[PDB]
Amino acid sequence: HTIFSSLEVNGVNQGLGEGVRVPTYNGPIEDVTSASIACNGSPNTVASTSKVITVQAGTNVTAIWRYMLSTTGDSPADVMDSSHKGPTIAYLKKVDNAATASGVGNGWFKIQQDGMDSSGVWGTERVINGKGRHSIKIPECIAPGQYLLRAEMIALHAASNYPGAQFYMECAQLNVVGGTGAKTPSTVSFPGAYSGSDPGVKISIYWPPVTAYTVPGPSVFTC
Ligand SMILES: *[C@@H]1O[C@H](CO)[C@@H](O)[C@H](O)[C@H]1NC(C)=O
Ligand SMILES: [Cu+2]
Numbered sequence: 001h002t003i004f005s006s007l008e009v010n011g012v013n014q015g016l017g018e019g020v021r022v023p024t025y026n027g028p029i030e031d032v033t034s035a036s037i038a039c040n041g042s043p044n045t046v047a048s049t050s051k052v053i054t055v056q057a058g059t060n061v062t063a064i065w066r067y068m069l070s071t072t073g074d075s076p077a078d079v080m081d082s083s084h085k086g087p088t089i090a091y092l093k094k095v096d097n098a099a100t101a102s103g104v105g106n107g108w109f110k111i112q113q114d115g116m117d118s119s120g121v122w123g124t125e126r127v128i129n130g131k132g133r134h135s136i137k138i139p140e141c142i143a144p145g146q147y148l149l150r151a152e153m154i155a156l157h158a159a160s161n162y163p164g165a166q167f168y169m170e171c172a173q174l175n176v177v178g179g180t181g182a183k184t185p186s187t188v189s190f191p192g193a194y195s196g197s198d199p200g201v202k203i204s205i206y207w208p209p210v211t212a213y214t215v216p217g218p219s220v221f222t223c
Pocket of ligand 2: 155166
C-alpha cells in the first residue's frame with residue numbers, strides 16, 4: 001500500500017500530485033486485464049492535474065513513493081510495508097497531450113526495472129529504505145514531446161496464486177525536451193503486457209526461496 005505521489009527533477013520536487021495523477025487511496029490494482037492497470041483507476045479514484053513537467057532527455061527523474069498523500073516523512077514505514085517485496089519498474093508512452101491522454105492501450109515501452117539483486121535484495125526494498133526514491137532514466141534517443149511516465153512497484157508477498165500480486169502505479173505527465181528521436185521503441189499495451197500466468201506475477205517468493213526473478217513485461221528499451 002503506497003502511492004507515487006510526486007516527481008523530483010533536477011533536484012527539485014515538483015509538488016504533491018503536481019504533474020502526477022494521484023489516487024487518495026493507496027490500495028493496489030490486482031486485475032492485470034483492467035483498464036486501471038495502465039495509470040491506476042477504478043475501484044480507486046485518481047485526480048487529474050494540468051501540470052506537465054519538463055525534463056531533459058538523457059537525465060534521470062525520481063519517483064517519490066509514500067504510504068499516503070498525507071505522509072510527511074520518508075522513513076521505511078512512510079513509504080511501504082517491508083513485507084511488500086518485489087520489483088520496481090517504469091515505462092513511457094508517447095501521447096498527444098500528457099494532461100488528457102488516458103494511458104490505456106498500446107504505446108508503452110519499459111525504461112527501468114529493478115527486480116532482485118545478487119544479494120537477494122528486491123527493488124521495492126531499495127525504495128522503502130531509500131527515502132521512497134525510485135530513479136528512472138529518460139532515454140536520450142527518444143523523440144521529444146508529450147509523454148506519460150508510468151512508475152510501478154509490484155508487491156509479491158501474497159502472489160503465490162493469481163490474483164495475488166499487488167500492482168501500485170501512477171502516471172506522471174512529461175514534456176521531454178532534447179530527445180534526438182534517433183530510435184523508435186517497440187511497444188506493448190496496458191492492459192496486455194502482463195498476464196496472471198507470468199513467472200514474475202504468479203510466484204511464491206518463499207517456496208522455495210527465490211534467488212533469481214523475471215520481471216514481467218518487455219525488455220528494457222536502450223539507446
Ligand atoms: C538512472 O536510472 C537508470 C534506470 O533507468 C539507472 O540505470 C541509473 O542508476 C539511474 N541513475 C542514478 C540512480 O543515479
Ligand atoms: Cu499493501
